[PDB]
Design a protein around this ligand. Structure first.
Ligand SMILES: CCCC(=O)c1ccc(N2CCN(CC)CC2)c(F)c1
Ligand SMILES: CCCC(=O)c1ccc(N2CCN(CC)CC2)c(F)c1
Lengths: 119, 122
């Protein structure tokens, strides 16, 4: 099944896609998610990307203390104490971001559906 | 030490206060905060509430697929497998929320500063 797999899944409240894992196959195209931000809810399979890690050169939306969710490009990956960080380039400068600080806008997630969508 | 203590701290980027733990004294009256949502950053001690659990009868803000950042009042606490859940009352009805799903609006957190503030300058 898809239970236990890492995904980037749309939260329909605002349309962005967020990293997490599928915890249950509910049936009829519905899955239960545990997002990395701790949120738990059901998400439809058509809005789940089976994409992990987010690939190098993907356009993403990333949070830091100086940037409230602005666009950047993935230029690296690092695991430290089992946790994934992304190196994201914005206006020619790079910083490391925790997995939960890297999301996809609706347009950015849509770009990945054909290749990575469940479905 | 404050390292390891559970707190509820204002995040200046959007004004709400969120649950987490102090992980480091970074000096300058600031502490590193690992929020329960997984985010890490430095926060002024003056903006940290030493408040755990969030007390009964506190007005809070809850998030679920049925409650969109809605105001409610803490009417219960439950610990199961070491995890804390809150029972929040709104319009006479109560639902259980996990810890990350209960936050404080700017006003809701501001209310608690005098009583629960870390108080780095006392
Ligand atoms: C109005 C309160 C502050 C605010 O703007 C806000 C808080 C939490 C949010 N969530 C991220 C997605 N996650 C689910 C993956 C749930 C929590 C969010 F989208 C916005
Ligand atoms: C751009 C869409 C909005 C959104 O996805 C979002 C995600 C995480 C947020 N934060 C909540 C507080 N947390 C602890 C301080 C940091 C993360 C938030 F306020 C909003």
């Amino acid at each position: 099944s898809f239970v236990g797999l890492r995904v980037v899944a749309k939260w329909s409240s605002n349309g962005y896609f967020y990293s997490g894992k599928i915890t249950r196959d509910v049936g009829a195209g519905k899955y239960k998610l545990l997002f990395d931000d701790g949120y738990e809810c059901d998400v439809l399979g058509k809005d789940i990307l089976l994409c992990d890690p987010i690939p190098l050169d993907t356009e993403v939306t990333a949070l830091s203390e100086d940037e409230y969710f602005s666009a950047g490009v993935v230029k690296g990956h690092r695991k430290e104490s089992g946790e994934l960080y992304y190196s994201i380039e914005k206006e020619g400068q790079r910083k490391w971001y925790k997995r939960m600080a890297v999301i996809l806008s609706l347009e950015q997630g849509n770009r990945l559906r054909e290749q990575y969508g469940l479905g």
